[PDB]
Homo-oligomer: A and B are copies of this chain.
Amino acid sequence: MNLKQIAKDTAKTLQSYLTYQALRTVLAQLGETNPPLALWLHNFSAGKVQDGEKYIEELFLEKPDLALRIMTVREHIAEEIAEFLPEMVVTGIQQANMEKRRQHLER
């Protein structure tokens, strides 16, 4: 019951988070390339980030080019870092669980 929809939701979350990460990449790439558009994008985006899939839908209605672009970026980041996350979140929590238990053992 748990793990099935625990992982299901976490996937939808990761999806949304990479979209934010795709946005912040397109921000910086535009930060140098087109300050005007970069400024516009940043202001428009503020707060929206919550849902990644709803965000593209919203951005499509405003400036479709930029919506498309983020889609290709999020796709590129996923394919190129996804395989490596399981070997990091596990060993990141395991490194945090051994370290915090050391603090409790002394004090």
Interface residue ranges, A against B (CB under 8 Å) = 1-3, 6-7, 9-15, 17-18, 21, 25, 52-53, 56-57, 60, 64, 67-68, 71-72, 74-90, 92-94, 96-97, 100-101, 103-104
Contacts and interface: CB of A to CB of B under 8 A. Distances in A.
Contact of A68 (B2, B3, B15, B101): B101
A15 B15 CA distance: 15
Given A77-B3, A82-B90, A14 B10 contact: yes
A11 B74 contact: no
Interface of A is mostly: helix
Contacts of A101: 68, 71
Contacts of A15: 89, 92-93, 96
A60 to B, nearest CB: 7
Contact of A78 (B1, B78, B81, B89): B89
A15 to B, nearest CB: 5
Contacts of A17: 10, 13
